[PDB]
Amino acid sequence: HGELQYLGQIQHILRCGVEKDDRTGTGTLSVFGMQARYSLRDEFPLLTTKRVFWKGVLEELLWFIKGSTNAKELSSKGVKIWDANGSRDFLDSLGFSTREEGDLGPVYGFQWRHFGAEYRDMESDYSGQGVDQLQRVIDTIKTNPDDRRIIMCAWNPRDLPLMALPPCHALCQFYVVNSELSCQLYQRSGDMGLGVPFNIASYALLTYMIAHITGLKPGDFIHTLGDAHIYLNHIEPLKIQLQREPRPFPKLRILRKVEKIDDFKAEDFQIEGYNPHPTIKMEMAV
Amino acid sequence: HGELQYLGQIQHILRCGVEKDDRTGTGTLSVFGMQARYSLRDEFPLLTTKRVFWKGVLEELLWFIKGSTNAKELSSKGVKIWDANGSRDFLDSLGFSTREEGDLGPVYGFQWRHFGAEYRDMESDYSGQGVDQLQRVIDTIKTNPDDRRIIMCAWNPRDLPLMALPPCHALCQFYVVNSELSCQLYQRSGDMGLGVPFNIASYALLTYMIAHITGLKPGDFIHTLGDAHIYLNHIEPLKIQLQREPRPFPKLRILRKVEKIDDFKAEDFQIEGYNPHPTIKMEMAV
Numbered sequence: 001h002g003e004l005q006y007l008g009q010i011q012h013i014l015r016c017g018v019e020k021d022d023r024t025g026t027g028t029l030s031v032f033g034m035q036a037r038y039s040l041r042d043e044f045p046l047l048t049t050k051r052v053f054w055k056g057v058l059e060e061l062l063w064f065i066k067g068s069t070n071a072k073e074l075s076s077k078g079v080k081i082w083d084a085n086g087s088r089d090f091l092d093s094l095g096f097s098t099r100e101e102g103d104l105g106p107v108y109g110f111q112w113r114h115f116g117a118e119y120r121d122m123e124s125d126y127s128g129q130g131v132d133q134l135q136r137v138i139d140t141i142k143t144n145p146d147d148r149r150i151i152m153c154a155w156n157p158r159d160l161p162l163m164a165l166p167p168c169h170a171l172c173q174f175y176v177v178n179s180e181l182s183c184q185l186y187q188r189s190g191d192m193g194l195g196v197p198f199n200i201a202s203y204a205l206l207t208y209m210i211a212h213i214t215g216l217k218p219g220d221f222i223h224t225l226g227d228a229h230i231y232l233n234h235i236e237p238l239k240i241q242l243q244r245e246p247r248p249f250p251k252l253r254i255l256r257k258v259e260k261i262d263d264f265k266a267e268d269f270q271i272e273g274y275n276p277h278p279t280i281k282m283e284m285a286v
Numbered sequence: 287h288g289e290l291q292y293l294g295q296i297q298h299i300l301r302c303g304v305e306k307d308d309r310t311g312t313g314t315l316s317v318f319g320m321q322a323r324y325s326l327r328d329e330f331p332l333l334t335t336k337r338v339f340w341k342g343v344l345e346e347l348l349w350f351i352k353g354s355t356n357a358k359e360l361s362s363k364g365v366k367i368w369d370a371n372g373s374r375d376f377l378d379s380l381g382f383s384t385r386e387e388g389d390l391g392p393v394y395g396f397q398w399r400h401f402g403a404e405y406r407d408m409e410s411d412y413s414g415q416g417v418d419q420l421q422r423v424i425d426t427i428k429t430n431p432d433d434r435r436i437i438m439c440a441w442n443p444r445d446l447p448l449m450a451l452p453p454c455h456a457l458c459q460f461y462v463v464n465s466e467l468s469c470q471l472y473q474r475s476g477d478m479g480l481g482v483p484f485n486i487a488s489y490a491l492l493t494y495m496i497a498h499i500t501g502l503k504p505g506d507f508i509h510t511l512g513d514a515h516i517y518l519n520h521i522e523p524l525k526i527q528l529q530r531e532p533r534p535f536p537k538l539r540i541l542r543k544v545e546k547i548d549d550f551k552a553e554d555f556q557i558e559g560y561n562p563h564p565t566i567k568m569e570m571a572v
């Protein structure tokens with residue numbers, strides 16, 4: 001199976017990791033530099049030893065492509081995952097006391113589509129200005145597949161101080177060989193219990209979406225970690241999930257041919273064959 | 287030994303890589319996503335199955351920290367490695383026909399120290415403007431070691447079109463645990479025969495330098511590849527080097543305590559125990 005790599009990384013961070021501190025004040029066992037490789041050929045990496053909130057996964061990605069930064073917008077669809085770092089309290093603690101709730105700042109979406117752009121408020125019109133990496137990437141795959149510079153980068157030094165919470169997935173690169181499209185991710189920081197599972201699915205999905213518009217077959221999703229940690233209050237839970245048998249990865253279908261990455265709607269995607277083991281609750285470290 | 291990982295990656299790219307094309311028009315066998323880990327504790331990763339131009343290695347890094355972009359300056363010291371992509375011909379072929387030879391453009395050095403900065407000519411004064419990642423990184427290690435955002439990024443989307451040759455080593459991150467400092471590198475593109483060997487040494491050196499000024503012990507250098515290729519005209523050569531026995535990695539010493547990363551001079555470093563196998567000539571793909 002493929003879900004064994006993930007389990008194993010967890011198995012390792014537990015028997016060889018080291019105690020560390022972090023901004024949350026919570027605990028953490030960590031390890032530096034790790035690499036796993038999931039196959040995207042006729043299967044989707046949606047963990048099974050636990051139930052993943054696929055709804056939030058899909059909504060968030062749609063939310064990113066949009067270029068939005070209002071943690072409220074995603075909340076409107078019923079995905080709370082980002083309301084925490086957009087809250088009034090969390091925002092005031094960083095000296096952003098003059099911002100309106102939900103303004104995450106120049107993060108993900110804004111970087112992907114308007115890199116150059118000069119940020120200022122979560123509801124300004126940034127169309128036409130900035131540099132669109134997401135699109136630049138697509139056109140290259142189409143015209144020049146062999147290029148070794150198909151990179152999309154979220155880490156923008158100039159803007160770091162305005163971000164309510166820096167890009168954990170900081171940079172990804174695509175590579176195409178013999179009709180199939182692959183993608184590698186560099187995740188400087190990984191919450192092995194909450195975000196990672198969500199992250200693996202988000203990039204596998206993005207790959208599928210790209211492959212479809214360019215007419216290629218998805219290949220491999222390579223996941224490279226930096227500080228792969230496990231918050232201390234996650235040890236008991238993960239320890240259970242580690243004793244669960246993995247069932248076959250599901251299959252994801254796109255029921256309607258789309259030719260613009262912006263035409264995608266939540267109804268265009270459907271999953272088949274998801275028989276996950278019951279959910280496992282884990283608290284988020286703020 | 288540690289040099290076996292490198293050899294092996296070469297061994298792999300040769301019996302499972304795939305034929306590919308590239309801008310140089312030369313050939314290439316490639317593989318996507320690879321990861322090696324070299325230990326920096328009481329040893330320096332200066333390859334032995336071949337003789338590495340340690341002089342150029344050291345000069346180039348000193349050249350980067352400086353923030354220089356004149357391929358001439360480094361040439362003045364006797365390190366030609368960058369005169370090729372700064373040449374009059376190479377520069378005119380990219381439409382930079384109004385630049386003076388040796389102006390690589392907003393590359394490495396300029397990004398490391400003056401990220402924000404608006405480039406314009408290789409001899410303008412960029413002091414005070416831009417954002418200094420190199421220094422930002424150092425102060426963090428000193429004040430807040432647990433930070434999971436100690437990143438230095440060279441990939442700057444806005445400037446790509448001005449660069450005569452984009453950052454192959456695009457991003458690196460530092461992590462500190464129990465008195466030792468480690469560093470991971472993401473190299474989107476790797477010329478397994480020429481640049482990589484040079485690159486592994488350049489980052490191990492930078493780590494040593496940082497560790498010294500912050501008073502820590504060097505730990506691990508993690509090398510993550512993207513398109514790890516082998517130009518076709520390198521196959522015969524590498525095939526020889528692969529049949530050579532590796533001798534112990536040398537040891538590097540800093541003979542004089544320095545407290546500013548800019549105070550470093552070439553005379554502050556000395557290597558001990560380097561018994562490499564004779565040189566191996568390989569032509570550069572322009």
Ligand SMILES: Nc1nc(=O)c2c(CCc3ccc(C(=O)N[C@@H](CCC(=O)O)C(=O)O)cc3)c[nH]c2[nH]1
Nearest residue numbers: 052053081085191194195198280281282284285286
């Ligand atoms: N410290 C920290 N870690 C992170 O991972 C993170 C993130 C990533 C987004 C995120 C947050 C919470 C859950 C989440 O809680 N997922 C639950 C399901 C919740 C539900 O049912 O709505 C899970 O167990 O997967 C899933 C994803 C933003 N800020 C963060 N800060």
Ligand SMILES: Nc1nc(=O)c2c(CCc3ccc(C(=O)N[C@@H](CCC(=O)O)C(=O)O)cc3)c[nH]c2[nH]1
Nearest residue numbers: 338339367371477480481484566567568570571572
């Ligand atoms: N295509 C391509 N590949 C690269 O690696 C590269 C670089 C990296 C710099 C570089 C170039 C050549 C040699 C080099 O020739 N090294 C020799 C020794 C040369 C000497 O003795 O002066 C070696 O065999 O190591 C060593 C390092 C810039 N532009 C490039 N373009």
Ligand SMILES: *c1cc(=O)[nH]c(=O)n1[C@H]1C[C@H](O)[C@@H](COP(=O)(O)O)O1
Nearest residue numbers: 023166168169189190191195196434
């Ligand atoms: C950040 C966002 C994401 O998409 N995925 C993640 O796993 N995370 C995690 C990483 C880390 O646990 C925390 C951010 O902390 P820090 O800024 O790295 O200190 O969220």
Ligand SMILES: *c1cc(=O)[nH]c(=O)n1[C@H]1C[C@H](O)[C@@H](COP(=O)(O)O)O1
Nearest residue numbers: 148309452454455475476477481482
């Ligand atoms: C680039 C610079 C460096 O320090 N190290 C490297 O190995 N290289 C190599 C990568 C690639 O072989 C070539 C650049 O080609 P491209 O821009 O990726 O097409 O130089």
